[PDB]
Amino acid sequence: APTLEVIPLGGMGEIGKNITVFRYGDEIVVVDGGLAFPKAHQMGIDLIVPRIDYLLEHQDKIKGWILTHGHEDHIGGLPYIFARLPRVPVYGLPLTLALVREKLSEFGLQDVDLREVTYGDEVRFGQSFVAEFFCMTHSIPDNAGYILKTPVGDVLHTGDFKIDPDVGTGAGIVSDLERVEQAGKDGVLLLISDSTNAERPGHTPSEAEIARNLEEIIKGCRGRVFLTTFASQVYRIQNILDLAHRQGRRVVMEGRSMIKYAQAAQATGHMNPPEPFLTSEEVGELQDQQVLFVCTGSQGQPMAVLGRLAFGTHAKIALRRGDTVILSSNPIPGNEDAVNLIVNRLYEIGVDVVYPPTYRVHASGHASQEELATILNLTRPKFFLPWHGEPRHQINHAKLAQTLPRPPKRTLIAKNGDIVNLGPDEFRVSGTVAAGAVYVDGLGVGDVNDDVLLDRVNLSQEGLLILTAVLHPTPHVEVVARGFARPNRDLELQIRRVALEAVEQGLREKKRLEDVRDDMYGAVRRFTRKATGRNPVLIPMIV
Amino acid sequence: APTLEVIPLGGMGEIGKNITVFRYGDEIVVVDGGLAFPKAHQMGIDLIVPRIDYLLEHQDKIKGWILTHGHEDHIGGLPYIFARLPRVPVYGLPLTLALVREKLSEFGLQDVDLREVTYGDEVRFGQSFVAEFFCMTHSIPDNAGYILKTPVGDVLHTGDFKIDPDVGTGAGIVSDLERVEQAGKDGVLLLISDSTNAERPGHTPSEAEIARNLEEIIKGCRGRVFLTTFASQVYRIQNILDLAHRQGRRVVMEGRSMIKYAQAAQATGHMNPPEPFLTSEEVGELQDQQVLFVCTGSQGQPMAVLGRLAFGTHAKIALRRGDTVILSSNPIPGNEDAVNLIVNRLYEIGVDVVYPPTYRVHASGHASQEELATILNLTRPKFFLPWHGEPRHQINHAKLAQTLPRPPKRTLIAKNGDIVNLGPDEFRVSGTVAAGAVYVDGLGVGDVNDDVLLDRVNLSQEGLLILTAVLHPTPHVEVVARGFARPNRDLELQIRRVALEAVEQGLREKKRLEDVRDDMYGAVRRFTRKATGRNPVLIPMIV
Ligand SMILES: O=c1ccn([C@@H]2O[C@H](COP(=O)(O)O)[C@@H](O)[C@H]2O)c(=O)[nH]1
Ligand SMILES: O=c1ccn([C@@H]2O[C@H](COP(=O)(O)O)[C@@H](O)[C@H]2O)c(=O)[nH]1
Ligand SMILES: [Mn+2]
Ligand SMILES: [Mn+2]
Ligand SMILES: [Zn+2]
Ligand SMILES: [Zn+2]
Ligand SMILES: [Zn+2]
Ligand SMILES: [Zn+2]
């Protein structure tokens, strides 16, 4: 009998560019459309978006979109994805849509059909799908999980979550554990659950506790306080606004990215400054102990605000001895060096530096094992797909589920492109569809691929040597080096002879000019390797 | 009132390339000859060595050398340093000198005057200096701190250390806290102490505890075990050989680096294999649970042994489900991504993966705050130079000393090149000498500098377009690309129009060839920036 197909196109076996496809018959529902940020080896590129070959192929089957929350790994790919697809209904909570709308406006995309929903709303897609939204606490407001009701049963997707009893903003926001528990009693065929922190024992700390730690620290700061956190951590920022007021400090917000999230949050009633934000010039009128900066740059970006402060390149402010800088954040994996470098810059300036683990001034947005186990125990799913995690995270999430009273009948470790067939008693990967990464580099989408990146790597490691041989009047060779070594006239002449004698040997014994080009390349490679121990990229031209 | 000059040339404000200069009158004693390994922005280079300009200027004053232990950041620079200096006496413990002797023989360095010492020995350097060696436990055997006795008073240098009550090898190795306490009574004018773990609360775990943990884990492993650890962790590896024997496993050691430290340790009595090492062929004859591999690649190096295992490129062995892989190691800062990649490959293969913090299978070689506090308390120093750390470590070591019952009179945060004047009542930075880094890249020493690196970074990020224009017979342009973009005919045709017209427009008014470069190079970039939004490095050539 017809089965549900769950086809992740991004977000499985990685943390980033989340997009999941649900297909039943000839109807498709898509969930999120995130981006990913480039790793160190993906040099020069700006962002990464999902391959949507599947969706282009079946674009007439798409009934609509669900957007769980406004983080970049869930809505960042949308300008790129929507531009290639028919306009379809796109459902999300208010902050999420605010962020997407601003994003599409930057892109110049028009007539996108964004539909505001709220927790509890049940939305229908085509004839065989109904989605019901429910609240899960996360590190951004208006974050949803959903129950997807299908002819074969119910799929419960947690979205991104932690179980935070108190996010500290006085708005009574809590995860809808009652709805989750009910779904378990009703029957959950498939659980899709956030695996980010599946290797962390215990419970992720509460934002209320972080806020209390921050207030205690700041309360004891004698001078100015500079604080950095993620741009989109609206709860953390709001709580910081509240304690700043209590501690008699006015707030300056700096950094486009954070100002952008702040503006959206204020427009949707999730950010409420007790006192107006001030400019740096305005707070310059106050005493040091009355000053708090909230700004970007927690990941050590030299061009971000904290970056410019740490490197002494900020236009209007200079850090000094007696300042306190707080990193209310942790380095995203791969940013350790960048953050270490700014931290050391700060210590050399002489400012008091505050960061984890010495100070507990950050809580992750994701459930640790106790919280993951709670969702598993409440939902009691027959089948289980650990999601939003690299393989290490998915597999340890799967191991955690085995320890529980009522382990799932089968757990699968899905990969992007996997076709996961779901029936009342079916749970298997039946096949694969085209999936992967598309690089965005400046205006270019997909014009930079791995083969292009491979060159960039080689250039990066070994630098460049251009050998141009000129046959007339008498054959001579020309050497141009870029990022190879500093000028060395002796070696330059030495490289010329090696190429030349190979060029003359291709003339002493006639070969095609194309053949001789390869011959001198090989000679110069051998010499240089012996002479310098280096293997520079050599570009020979016999023209 | 002659003063002692303490001149760090490397190892202050960094972890790596330790070398410290002590000058009094016209006598110089040098301590250590370390390299540093490159960071991510120093692409393509193999290693980094100290600038020794100061020693070159003053080479006749050098009376002797002290070598505290055999780690790369204390002896790795020696082949490059000794080659430019007079052959002075070089004092060290036996394993230290065995490692140095191998290293110097590879470089062709003849007649280096290596002199073995033993703990407790007093070594005189000219009139002004007497040095006394003493034992500090570390993550390599034959590791020493020393007391340097000068006319102005006594300098105690901890060397690299932890305070490990039991390294587990049964040879009764302990730190000489008695001698250190006695130095405190005799009077310690200056204390130089290892700041590596100064931000870590508590006490670094004992190797004996790590060995017990490993044995408990390995006891439970149903099949083959693969364990990686630092090549020079002689204690850990010996402990593993003995636990392996007890658990009835035979041991294979692979990885050139590890075998190298193993051979020197064996030759100097610090490693005694209870059973002979077997080859991978030979263990292949045994049952799975009789097999233990000890190998390199703990840092994620794809070509190292664990690397090739994880990527499935090892010539003779293939990991499989049921295997257990233990990373008895932590990622050295900056290696997190490389190790994470290996770990995920291992999960995907399906092996059991054991690493910290989930399993306590690694302990640092360096003292945490409790151990640091002990040394400060025992030495009771008048002046304090926190050393072997980045500024964050140094300054946190300085704060730690302030919390203690008898804080130092003055503490300074030294930088490389600082002239620290030491008197009975003087402690200040009076001057600076030339200090810094020298890049080694293949055979070349100092032929790659920061300016060269800037280019490699540039190539790395934006790719390359070589652009050639010949005015004859009529103006035209030819293009070779590297790492810029995937082949696009429209883009390529369009770049030449900018390039050729600028040559033709440049041709209309007779122009110098160099003037053509400005129009030609300038034309493509102007266009290219509009077209792709990117700025590839361009090499203009007139044919
Ligand atoms: O806005 C965010 C927040 C978190 N993360 C990353 O996703 C994981 C979860 O972060 P958090 O939600 O726990 O802050 C972490 O690895 C973090 O680096 C992001 O990329 N962007
Ligand atoms: O390049 C290096 C080498 C060693 N360590 C330090 O060495 C300690 C582990 O002890 P050991 O086994 O490396 O001596 C760690 O705390 C680590 O900080 C570094 O940080 N960077
Ligand atoms: Mn780019
Ligand atoms: Mn190189
Ligand atoms: Zn999120
Ligand atoms: Zn997410
Ligand atoms: Zn060491
Ligand atoms: Zn060291």
mmCIF file of N, CA, C and O in Angstrom, chain B residues 214-215 218-225 239-252 274-276 278 283 285-293:
data_model
loop_
_atom_site.group_PDB
_atom_site.id
_atom_site.type_symbol
_atom_site.label_atom_id
_atom_site.label_comp_id
_atom_site.label_asym_id
_atom_site.label_seq_id
_atom_site.Cartn_x
_atom_site.Cartn_y
_atom_site.Cartn_z
ATOM 1 N N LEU B 214 41.920 2.881 31.197
ATOM 2 C CA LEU B 214 42.125 2.242 29.907
ATOM 3 C C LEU B 214 41.999 0.740 30.042
ATOM 4 O O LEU B 214 41.382 0.070 29.213
ATOM 5 N N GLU B 215 42.587 0.202 31.103
ATOM 6 C CA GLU B 215 42.538 -1.233 31.306
ATOM 7 C C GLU B 215 41.101 -1.708 31.522
ATOM 8 O O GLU B 215 40.699 -2.739 30.988
ATOM 9 N N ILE B 218 39.485 -1.585 28.091
ATOM 10 C CA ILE B 218 40.007 -2.563 27.139
ATOM 11 C C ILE B 218 39.619 -3.968 27.587
ATOM 12 O O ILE B 218 39.340 -4.845 26.762
ATOM 13 N N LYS B 219 39.565 -4.162 28.902
ATOM 14 C CA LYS B 219 39.100 -5.420 29.475
ATOM 15 C C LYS B 219 37.730 -5.795 28.906
ATOM 16 O O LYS B 219 37.467 -6.960 28.606
ATOM 17 N N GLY B 220 36.877 -4.789 28.726
ATOM 18 C CA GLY B 220 35.529 -4.990 28.215
ATOM 19 C C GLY B 220 35.377 -5.104 26.704
ATOM 20 O O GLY B 220 34.362 -5.610 26.220
ATOM 21 N N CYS B 221 36.376 -4.640 25.952
ATOM 22 C CA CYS B 221 36.309 -4.684 24.491
ATOM 23 C C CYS B 221 36.277 -6.103 23.959
ATOM 24 O O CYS B 221 37.178 -6.901 24.205
ATOM 25 N N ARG B 222 35.214 -6.394 23.218
ATOM 26 C CA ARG B 222 34.928 -7.735 22.740
ATOM 27 C C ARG B 222 35.874 -8.162 21.620
ATOM 28 O O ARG B 222 36.196 -9.340 21.483
ATOM 29 N N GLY B 223 36.315 -7.197 20.818
ATOM 30 C CA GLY B 223 37.173 -7.498 19.686
ATOM 31 C C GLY B 223 38.473 -6.715 19.688
ATOM 32 O O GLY B 223 39.041 -6.427 20.749
ATOM 33 N N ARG B 224 38.940 -6.379 18.488
ATOM 34 C CA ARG B 224 40.160 -5.598 18.301
ATOM 35 C C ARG B 224 40.075 -4.218 18.926
ATOM 36 O O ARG B 224 39.011 -3.594 18.967
ATOM 37 N N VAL B 225 41.213 -3.730 19.382
ATOM 38 C CA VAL B 225 41.323 -2.391 19.930
ATOM 39 C C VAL B 225 42.380 -1.574 19.188
ATOM 40 O O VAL B 225 43.483 -2.043 18.959
ATOM 41 N N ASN B 239 52.506 2.055 30.050
ATOM 42 C CA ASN B 239 51.332 1.611 30.799
ATOM 43 C C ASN B 239 50.393 0.764 29.943
ATOM 44 O O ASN B 239 49.843 -0.237 30.416
ATOM 45 N N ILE B 240 50.231 1.155 28.676
ATOM 46 C CA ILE B 240 49.379 0.409 27.755
ATOM 47 C C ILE B 240 49.994 -0.938 27.408
ATOM 48 O O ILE B 240 49.279 -1.936 27.333
ATOM 49 N N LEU B 241 51.313 -0.993 27.244
ATOM 50 C CA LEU B 241 51.967 -2.267 26.942
ATOM 51 C C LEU B 241 51.778 -3.279 28.072
ATOM 52 O O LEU B 241 51.612 -4.472 27.836
ATOM 53 N N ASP B 242 51.801 -2.788 29.299
ATOM 54 C CA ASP B 242 51.700 -3.660 30.458
ATOM 55 C C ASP B 242 50.255 -4.105 30.679
ATOM 56 O O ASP B 242 49.990 -5.279 30.937
ATOM 57 N N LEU B 243 49.321 -3.174 30.562
ATOM 58 C CA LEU B 243 47.917 -3.546 30.675
ATOM 59 C C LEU B 243 47.538 -4.477 29.530
ATOM 60 O O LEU B 243 46.763 -5.407 29.727
ATOM 61 N N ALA B 244 48.094 -4.246 28.345
ATOM 62 C CA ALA B 244 47.801 -5.116 27.202
ATOM 63 C C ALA B 244 48.205 -6.558 27.496
ATOM 64 O O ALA B 244 47.428 -7.487 27.259
ATOM 65 N N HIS B 245 49.420 -6.722 28.024
ATOM 66 C CA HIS B 245 49.960 -8.021 28.410
ATOM 67 C C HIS B 245 49.062 -8.720 29.418
ATOM 68 O O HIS B 245 48.806 -9.920 29.309
ATOM 69 N N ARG B 246 48.588 -7.956 30.398
ATOM 70 C CA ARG B 246 47.724 -8.492 31.437
ATOM 71 C C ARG B 246 46.368 -8.926 30.888
ATOM 72 O O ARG B 246 45.764 -9.864 31.399
ATOM 73 N N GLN B 247 45.901 -8.240 29.848
ATOM 74 C CA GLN B 247 44.606 -8.533 29.247
ATOM 75 C C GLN B 247 44.741 -9.504 28.089
ATOM 76 O O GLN B 247 43.772 -9.797 27.389
ATOM 77 N N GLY B 248 45.948 -10.009 27.891
ATOM 78 C CA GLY B 248 46.178 -11.038 26.899
ATOM 79 C C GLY B 248 46.101 -10.524 25.475
ATOM 80 O O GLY B 248 45.734 -11.251 24.565
ATOM 81 N N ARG B 249 46.453 -9.266 25.267
ATOM 82 C CA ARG B 249 46.533 -8.754 23.906
ATOM 83 C C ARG B 249 47.966 -8.543 23.458
ATOM 84 O O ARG B 249 48.802 -8.082 24.226
ATOM 85 N N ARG B 250 48.251 -8.897 22.211
ATOM 86 C CA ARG B 250 49.542 -8.561 21.627
ATOM 87 C C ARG B 250 49.467 -7.166 21.003
ATOM 88 O O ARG B 250 48.394 -6.715 20.599
ATOM 89 N N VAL B 251 50.613 -6.495 20.930
ATOM 90 C CA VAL B 251 50.681 -5.079 20.574
ATOM 91 C C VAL B 251 51.408 -4.825 19.251
ATOM 92 O O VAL B 251 52.514 -5.303 19.026
ATOM 93 N N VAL B 252 50.755 -4.070 18.374
ATOM 94 C CA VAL B 252 51.385 -3.585 17.158
ATOM 95 C C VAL B 252 51.540 -2.087 17.291
ATOM 96 O O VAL B 252 50.603 -1.392 17.672
ATOM 97 N N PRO B 274 56.855 -5.705 27.728
ATOM 98 C CA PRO B 274 56.799 -7.008 28.403
ATOM 99 C C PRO B 274 56.804 -8.130 27.377
ATOM 100 O O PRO B 274 57.369 -9.190 27.620
ATOM 101 N N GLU B 275 56.187 -7.884 26.226
ATOM 102 C CA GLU B 275 56.288 -8.798 25.102
ATOM 103 C C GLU B 275 56.763 -8.031 23.886
ATOM 104 O O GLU B 275 56.600 -6.818 23.822
ATOM 105 N N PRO B 276 57.381 -8.733 22.929
ATOM 106 C CA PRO B 276 57.816 -8.077 21.692
ATOM 107 C C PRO B 276 56.634 -7.518 20.889
ATOM 108 O O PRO B 276 55.559 -8.130 20.863
ATOM 109 N N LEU B 278 54.492 -6.928 17.665
ATOM 110 C CA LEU B 278 54.220 -7.742 16.497
ATOM 111 C C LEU B 278 53.880 -6.852 15.321
ATOM 112 O O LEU B 278 53.517 -5.691 15.497
ATOM 113 N N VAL B 283 49.815 -10.244 14.055
ATOM 114 C CA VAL B 283 48.631 -10.240 14.908
ATOM 115 C C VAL B 283 47.431 -10.774 14.160
ATOM 116 O O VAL B 283 46.486 -11.269 14.774
ATOM 117 N N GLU B 285 47.112 -13.347 12.835
ATOM 118 C CA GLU B 285 47.002 -14.778 13.078
ATOM 119 C C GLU B 285 46.223 -15.055 14.358
ATOM 120 O O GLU B 285 45.804 -16.178 14.613
ATOM 121 N N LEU B 286 46.034 -14.014 15.152
ATOM 122 C CA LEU B 286 45.390 -14.126 16.451
ATOM 123 C C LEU B 286 43.900 -13.776 16.402
ATOM 124 O O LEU B 286 43.429 -13.171 15.439
ATOM 125 N N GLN B 287 43.168 -14.145 17.449
ATOM 126 C CA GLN B 287 41.765 -13.745 17.592
ATOM 127 C C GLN B 287 41.633 -12.234 17.756
ATOM 128 O O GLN B 287 42.584 -11.568 18.155
ATOM 129 N N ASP B 288 40.452 -11.696 17.460
ATOM 130 C CA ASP B 288 40.207 -10.252 17.542
ATOM 131 C C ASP B 288 40.480 -9.661 18.918
ATOM 132 O O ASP B 288 41.067 -8.578 19.033
ATOM 133 N N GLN B 289 40.049 -10.359 19.963
ATOM 134 C CA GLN B 289 40.205 -9.827 21.313
ATOM 135 C C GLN B 289 41.632 -10.000 21.850
ATOM 136 O O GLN B 289 41.893 -9.693 23.002
ATOM 137 N N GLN B 290 42.541 -10.486 21.013
ATOM 138 C CA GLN B 290 43.954 -10.593 21.380
ATOM 139 C C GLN B 290 44.783 -9.480 20.748
ATOM 140 O O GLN B 290 46.012 -9.500 20.801
ATOM 141 N N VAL B 291 44.108 -8.520 20.127
ATOM 142 C CA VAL B 291 44.789 -7.548 19.281
ATOM 143 C C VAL B 291 44.732 -6.134 19.827
ATOM 144 O O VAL B 291 43.662 -5.623 20.168
ATOM 145 N N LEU B 292 45.890 -5.491 19.914
ATOM 146 C CA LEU B 292 45.919 -4.089 20.281
ATOM 147 C C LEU B 292 46.889 -3.311 19.397
ATOM 148 O O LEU B 292 48.081 -3.601 19.351
ATOM 149 N N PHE B 293 46.350 -2.326 18.690
ATOM 150 C CA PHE B 293 47.151 -1.432 17.871
ATOM 151 C C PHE B 293 47.376 -0.118 18.580
ATOM 152 O O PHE B 293 46.420 0.494 19.061
#
